[PDB]
Amino acid sequence: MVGSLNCIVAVSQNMGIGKNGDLPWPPLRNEFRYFQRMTTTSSVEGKQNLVIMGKKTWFSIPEKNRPLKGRINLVLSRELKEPPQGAHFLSRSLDDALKLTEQPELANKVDMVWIVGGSSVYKEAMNHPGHLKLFVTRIMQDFESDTFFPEIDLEKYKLLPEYPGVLSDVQEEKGIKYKFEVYEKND
Ligand SMILES: NC(=O)c1ccc[n+]([C@@H]2O[C@H](COP(=O)([O-])OP(=O)(O)OC[C@H]3O[C@@H](n4cnc5c(N)ncnc54)[C@H](OP(=O)(O)O)[C@@H]3O)[C@@H](O)[C@H]2O)c1
Ligand SMILES: CCc1nc(N)nc(N)c1OCCCCOc1ccccc1CCc1nnn[nH]1
Ligand SMILES: [Cl-]
Ligand SMILES: [Cl-]
Ligand SMILES: [Cl-]
């Protein structure tokens, strides 16, 4: 069937993830490469991963890069009547999106599911019962932000010391240090 359920996010020390429709920090090439590799790579031959994102996250991607290449793209919105141009799936909630992954059109095409933001998308996922992993890049600086990542409940999640294919040491680009973290729960 469909593979694992995952969130991926990059978060500043003040829990910020975005600012004026953009990232709060200047672009970090390798953080982007990690995001792309993690969400694109599929363990199952012939299948692609599904990325689920909110409407504002969709429109924050430059038009030339939509939809996200090599992945099935799904947008969450209650106001849009049809998937925006370049997208082919649109759901009213994360719960609806996950139910959509068991219909034939998605079931045998989708491996892993990756929630890629923004704030209210993460929130619905981290309430969702069941097996969930959070791939969290800790950007070790404050940045002025206007949208935030919900705090992790450490009574539900375990922080894994290492995760396969993920370096656990401090990264640094453009004067900005950060670390890749992986949390897991199984409600
Ligand atoms: N650092 C990171 O990892 C990261 C990741 C993603 C985005 N960002 C940045 O954060 C900002 C975009 O994120 P955002 O939080 O402001 O907006 P967003 O979550 O991407 O989009 C918000 C809209 O999407 C719909 N939506 C969101 N969650 C939903 C849910 N659970 N169920 C149904 N619909 C849902 C709603 O659309 P309707 O009003 O039409 O119903 C909502 O108004 C940008 O600045 C972006 O650059 C950062
Ligand atoms: C890399 C940031 C990030 N990192 C982690 N770990 N998780 C996330 N969910 C995450 O956000 C992804 C946001 C949706 C994909 O955004 C794309 C895709 C292609 C081109 C430009 C953008 C706009 C953001 C941007 N990235 N670099 N410059 N601009
Ligand atoms: Cl990408
Ligand atoms: Cl692949
Ligand atoms: Cl946290």
* d(C-alpha 110, C-alpha 1), whole Å: 8
Distance 13 CA to ligand 5 centre (A): 9
Q: How far apart are CA 124 and CA 29, in angstroms?
A: 29
Resolution rounded to one decimal, in angstroms:
2.2
For residue 68, CA distances in Å to 115, 163, 184 come to 13, 24, 25
Closest CA to 153 of 122, 113, 118: 122
Do the Cβ atoms of 58 and 75 come closer than 8 Å?
yes
Instruction: Look up residue 54 and give its two tokens.
Output: 């909110």
Question: Which residues have a catalytic role annotated?
Answer: 23, 31
Place of tokens 């991926």: 8
d(CA 143, CA 154): 24
24 in contact with ligand 1, CB cutoff 6 A: no
Mutate to test the pocket of ligand 1, among 19, 74, 121 (most ligand atoms within 8 A of CB): 121
Which residues have a Cβ under 8 Å from the Cβ of 154 and sit 6 or more positions away? none
Q: Are 54 and 121 in contact (CB under 8 A)?
A: yes
Residue 51, token pair as written in the block: 């990325």
A 10 A CB-CB count for 175 gives 7
Q: Is 65 annotated as a binding residue?
A: yes
By the 8 A CB rule, do 133 and 184 touch? yes
Q: Which of 6, 23, 119, 121 to mutate to test the pocket of ligand 2 (most atoms within 8 A of CB)?
A: 23
Specify the experimental method.
X-ray
CA distance 74 to 21: 19
Side chain identity at residue 112, one-letter code: M
Question: Per the structure block, which two tokens stand in for 21?
Answer: 């429709």
Q: How far apart, in whole angstroms, are the C-alpha atoms of residue 35 and residue 70?
A: 13
Residue carrying structure tokens 């990232």:
23
Phi/psi for 140 (5° steps) reads -90, 50
Please confirm whether the linkage preceding 118 is cis (ω < 30° from 0): yes
8 contacts 116 by C-beta, under 8 angstroms: yes
Cα–ligand 1 centroid distance for 146 (angstroms): 12
Q: Which atom of ligand 1 is nearest to the CA of 124?
A: 31
Contact 97, 52 (CB under 8 A): yes
Does ligand 1 come within 6 angstroms of the Cβ of 18? yes
